[model samples]
Target: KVFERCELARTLKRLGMDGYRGISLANWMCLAKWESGYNTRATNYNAGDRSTDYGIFQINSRYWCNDGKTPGAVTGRGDSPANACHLSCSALLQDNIADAVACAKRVVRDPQGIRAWVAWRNRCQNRDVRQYVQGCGV
Candidate 1:
């Protein structure tokens, strides 16, 4: 489920990502672009960190969501170990993206805001992100 650039922009906008957490739609688009290339089925397993990045937003199994194998899901004595997003990691892999967007919204509620995503800092920040929104009518 790799999404076209403008198509993803429009979809994210519809999911209320345009101005979520004071971050513009372009930045969200940029994050998704670098994180998963807008592919809903994308998954990244970090052998070094013991965390799995799931789906388009690459939501981590470590602290944000539960996958039964991550530290938080297994050990129960940490922050938001009960699933801060209150969702299963499998939900993020669906093409619907509704739950994925909602979990993403919850992530920014932390002090880090959009800075939670490394890609946003290295690629989208202070860059000409206008290209993500330009001609998209989002």
Candidate 2:
């Protein structure tokens, strides 16, 4: 699903993401823009390990979603790693982003915080990322 920036901001705010799970809405919106361009089905297979990033937040197949083809899933190391957000990988690829938001919350709680997303660091961090939501009336 592709959302207009304002529409996405409204949706994110409605889902309680404005400050949910200790992450600011501005940061979340910026991350979403840089990571997936607000495209729900966006997947990036750029990791050197061949792991892919899935959905809007680009949750990694290495430590998160189970692609079923990864060695961890074949071996049983998949339990703790796969479905860490208690969601199926496909679930994050839909128009609805509640699951993605929930999963991202889990990520933010980790020691890495928002830095878990390289995109955020490279493009959104320390910058006025609120521009992504400017005039959205959030």
Candidate 3:
């Protein structure tokens, strides 16, 4: 839960600092809470092929692993994609907490901000939740 929350917090900060004012910190926190309960290791049994999902925000293992040449790739440090992030879960997962944070920050820093994130989440299912709300004490 701590690790997942960390990622969510980092991403929110990046979005805010990057000029994407459309997404408030409260919104990010709310989405993070609703998404994976701040558990990067969370997974969905009804996902894609291997049915393995991961990350603080619950990014799919396959998407991060099989995506090819991405920072979220598995470094064989854990069992699954979420495992790759360490504090999360899974096997054959690469442990790169810093890198994962960097990747997320890079995205949030983009001009797209939450809007782009929403589109990406809808299309890629990288666990980017639209549940951005305020006053959640995130």
Candidate 4:
């Protein structure tokens, strides 16, 4: 499902994204826009690591979710953690976005916080992210 900008902003706010882990709703809005353009089913395959980034937040297979076939386990990194979110990668693709939101929260628990998403760092970080939520009434 593709959501309008305000629609996504409001939904994310309602899901408790605002001030989540000290990351504002505007930042989340900016990240989601750049990551997948608010499309729930977006997916990107990484040829370098042989892992796929899935869904609206582009949660990665390498260190985030599991599909029983991601390469992190076989790349000889014996310490690699699998499915830290305790969810299948498939859960991130649903239109509901509830599962995706939950997993995203789990991801930010690390020291990286929201910086875990490259899109957020490059596009949303230190920018006028307020533009994303300004008129959304979030």
In model 1, which residue pairs have backbone atoms overlapping below 3 Å? Answer: none
Worst window of 10 by summed lDDT in candidate 4: 71-80
Query: 53-104 in candidate 3: lDDT tens per residue?
Result: 4454444443333333224444566564432333333432334334444444
TM-score of each: 0.92, 0.88, 0.41, 0.93
User: lDDT scores for all predictions?
Assistant: 0.88, 0.82, 0.44, 0.89
Better of 2 and 3 by lDDT: 2
Q: Indicate whether candidate 1 or candidate 3 has the larger lDDT.
A: 1
Q: Write the per-residue lDDT of candidate 2 for residues 1-138, one digit (tens) a residue.
A: 998899999998988887765678889999988898899999888546777788988998766666765445444443354557877778789888988888888788778888998899999878987688789898
Residue 112 lDDT, candidate 1, scale 0-100: 97
Report how far off residue 61 is in candidate 2 (Å).
1.3
The 10 consecutive residues of candidate 2 with the worst lDDT sum are 70-79
Best by TM-score: 4
Which regions of candidate 2 deviate over 4 angstroms?
73-79
Tens-place lDDT per residue, model 4, 5-124, is 999998998999899999889888888899999999999999888899889999998888988877656555666688888889999999999999999998999999998988788888
